Amino acid sequence: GKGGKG
Amino acid sequence: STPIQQLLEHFLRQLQRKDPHGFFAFPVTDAIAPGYSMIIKHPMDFGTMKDKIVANEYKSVTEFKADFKLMCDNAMTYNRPDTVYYKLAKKILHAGFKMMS
Amino acid sequence: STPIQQLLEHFLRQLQRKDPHGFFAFPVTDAIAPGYSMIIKHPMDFGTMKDKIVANEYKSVTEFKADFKLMCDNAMTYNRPDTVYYKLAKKILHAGFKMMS
């Protein structure tokens, strides 16, 4: 749902 | 329950109504937002604002507005501009300040 | 296996060595990268490039170079500037191009 990768 | 408290609680209830999914209700965690705590130095959310009302930590509308602005600026900093999150934060930042004026 | 094939396979092995975590080895999925497919319209990665070498789909080093660039640009577009991914994509884009000159 939220943010980018990691 | 001071007069400033019932003023700020009304403002808080009206601002929360503008976030019907509750994206701003609680602290963001790094688990739902990779790298959040290293990018955002001072997290804020509506649940934290409510607590600070009750702790008598706001002495003025200006201090309350400053935390609202920090919550919106954090969202516009962390989230990319095409996201649901970024768009909502911009939308409510400006409407919220207009409502409190 | 043609001569352009052993040339591009050499360049590919040398570019892959610059990505020791394999961040660029395989297609990115929306599950590891929310919203990816709606933001990046033409995905590329080293596994795809290797396949395209083998399908003889590259007739020139320039076409190969274009897909490399597209891979790096996608990463710089999706990922925020502070991330491992963005920094690595910038670093390898410019060094890879220097190398293939």
Side-chain angles (χ1 to χ4, degrees):
Chain A
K2 179 153 165 176
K5 321 189 188 181
Chain B
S1 185
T2 54
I4 185 79
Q5 271 155 340
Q6 41 186 303
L7 185 51
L8 290 189
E9 307 252 27
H10 184 73
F11 284 168
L12 192 52
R13 287 191 304 274
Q14 263 186 290
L15 302 164
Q16 293 221 254
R17 291 201 18 205
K18 304 185 181 280
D19 158 44
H21 291 295
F23 294 151
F24 285 101
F26 301 121
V28 175
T29 53
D30 290 6
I32 75 172
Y36 192 81
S37 62
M38 278 291 273
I39 297 157
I40 300 307
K41 290 331 199 176
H42 295 99
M44 190 41 56
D45 57 275
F46 281 141
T48 301
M49 296 177 62
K50 162 86 162 165
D51 297 339
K52 284 171 70 158
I53 300 175
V54 187
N56 263 1
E57 275 179 66
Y58 305 115
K59 297 294 156 173
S60 72
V61 178
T62 313
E63 297 164 0
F64 171 85
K65 282 183 160 175
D67 266 351
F68 181 58
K69 175 176 193 287
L70 169 57
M71 180 188 77
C72 300
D73 291 342
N74 290 337
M76 290 175 319
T77 297
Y78 178 74
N79 301 274
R80 269 177 46 101
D82 36 80
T83 63
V84 171
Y85 305 109
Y86 180 104
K87 290 178 194 190
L88 184 62
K90 192 169 169 225
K91 191 191 134 86
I92 80 175
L93 173 65
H94 292 99
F97 266 68
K98 210 200 162 155
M99 187 261 292
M100 291 193 277
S101 261
Chain C
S1 189
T2 52
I4 183 77
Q5 271 164 336
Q6 40 188 304
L7 185 57
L8 298 188
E9 296 256 10
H10 183 74
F11 285 162
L12 187 55
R13 286 199 297 278
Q14 263 184 290
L15 304 167
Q16 289 228 245
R17 295 191 27 194
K18 292 196 219 270
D19 165 42
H21 289 287
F23 293 149
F24 287 95
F26 302 116
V28 168
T29 65
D30 286 6
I32 70 176
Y36 190 81
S37 67
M38 278 288 270
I39 292 155
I40 299 308
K41 291 160 170 274
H42 293 102
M44 184 52 56
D45 53 281
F46 287 139
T48 310
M49 291 175 75
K50 148 84 170 186
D51 295 338
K52 284 176 69 172
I53 297 174
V54 167
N56 263 317
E57 302 181 16
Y58 299 124
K59 301 285 159 173
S60 76
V61 173
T62 312
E63 286 164 6
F64 172 83
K65 279 190 196 194
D67 262 353
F68 183 58
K69 174 166 182 321
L70 167 61
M71 184 186 77
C72 295
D73 285 350
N74 284 342
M76 289 178 320
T77 295
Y78 179 77
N79 301 275
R80 273 172 54 103
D82 33 280
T83 55
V84 192
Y85 305 107
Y86 182 110
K87 302 198 164 79
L88 180 62
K90 196 163 161 244
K91 187 182 184 160
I92 192 153
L93 168 67
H94 289 98
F97 267 63
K98 218 155 186 274
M99 186 263 280
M100 289 188 283
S101 275

